[PDB]
Amino acid sequence: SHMVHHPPSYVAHLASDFGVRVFQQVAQASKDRNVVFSPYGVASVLAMLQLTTGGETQQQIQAAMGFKIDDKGMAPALRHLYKELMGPWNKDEISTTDAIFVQRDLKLVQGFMPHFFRLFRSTVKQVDFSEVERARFIINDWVKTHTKGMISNLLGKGAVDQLTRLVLVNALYFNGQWKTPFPDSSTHRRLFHKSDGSTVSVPMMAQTNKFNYTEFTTPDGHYYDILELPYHGDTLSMFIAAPYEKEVPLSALTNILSAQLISHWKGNMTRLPRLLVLPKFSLETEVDLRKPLENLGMTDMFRQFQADFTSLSDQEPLHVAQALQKVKIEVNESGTVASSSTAVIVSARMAPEEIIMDRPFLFVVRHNPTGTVLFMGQVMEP
């Protein structure tokens, strides 16, 4: 069973593994980067890109993701995966939506509409991008809606222009209540010692409970606590990995990180009494994916005369200028609220990346019945 898999029956893991690998690229770019990410959000947009691209452009994408979205049986597996995530038995709220915004006078290949509907239950949204500010507002309002108001201005000044012809977006929203809330009385400020010899007062939470816990050591010998913090629906939890030593950089963990690794942790954990100290944080970040996707073999889609979008339209040539992801998380005593908006844009440009860096720990938000990794991030260590 570990060596042989039926791909549609394994799509959750495959999509999660691909999305994790994209996070590694983002993490490997900057040391100790405080960033929040959605593996599931990037997998959903790139899966859409498998329907829109053709030729080598599509080949390259299917290769990196390590599965084909149009394989026999994928459709019913995707319907089942959506239901499992969305259903009310989860208690904690999850919401995922996908959209393709396309220049209105653009003739699309006949076979595209049924595919997009079979796999994404979605319908291409025609917009006239030559009306730049209106179009920016149309896509922005849609993102603001499907993230429940959390991401209001994904697309700022210059993110789209008259030459924009295609935008693909996924909006992902998560709202969970801890199974056991952290008690208000044990919230306190704690000091964090920066590298420049200075200090900052950070609000800290704490709770003692029986937590699924495991120890973990890497090939080079470095130790980490892995604790699982559950949401009240019993289907979702936050896995937390924290290093034992201040001399071990988090890259020793993130460089070997995988979806199977997290599955192995969850599989090999035991319930133990532990005190948990976790920060009360809000993190908002936006990462470029162009380079990270280029590093994983997907270069054709960004290149003016090599790019092949013929499964969507052979009417006119198209290539990707921007691939990005804007993400927001808020963790308090009663729970977590997180959202992400993943976008691939033709034309215009992406403002330079703003990067914050500070010795971090790792968190993973994971839907357990399916193995779907929804959010993961590197945040400031207590």
Using CB under 6 A as the criterion, which residues of the chain lie in contact with ligand TB7 when the complex forms? Answer: 11, 15, 40, 43-44, 47, 78, 81-82, 96-98, 120-122
Please provide the DSSP assignment of 12-55 as one string.
HHHHHHHHHHHHHHHHHHSTTB-EEE-HHHHHHHHHHHHHH--H
Q: Which two tokens stand for residue 33?
A: 């980067």
Cα 283 from Cα 377, distance rounded (Å): 9
Residue nearer to ligand TB7 on the CB measure, 11 or 298: 11
Cα 311 from Cα 50, distance rounded (Å): 9
Q: Which two tokens stand for residue 61?
A: 């994408």
Q: What long-range pairs does 221-225 form, CB within 8 A, spacing at least 24?
A: 222/248, 222/252, 222/253, 223/248, 224/253
Residue nearer to ligand TB7 on the CB measure, 47 or 257: 47
Of 240, 180, 242, 268, the residue nearest 366 (C-alpha): 240
Q: Which two tokens stand for residue 308?
A: 């092949």
| Least distance to ligand TB7, CB of residue 188, Å | 40
Residue nearer to ligand TB7 on the CB measure, 40 or 239: 40
Residue 151: partners with Cβ closer than 8 Å, 6 or more residues away: 143, 144, 171, 326, 328, 339, 340, 341
Residue nearer to ligand TB7 on the CB measure, 16 or 347: 16
Q: Which two tokens stand for residue 267?
A: 């599989």
Q: 47 to each of 68, 173, 247, 257, 294, how far by Cα in Å? A: 8, 19, 39, 22, 16
Task: Report strand pairing: 93-103 vs 125-127.
Answer: parallel
Of 139, 140, 135, 160, the residue nearest 150 (C-alpha): 140
Residue 73: partners with Cβ closer than 8 Å, 6 or more residues away: 8
Residue type, position 56, single letter: E
Helices (H), the chain: 11-29, 39-52, 55-65, 74-86, 112-120, 132-146, 251-254, 259-267, 290-295
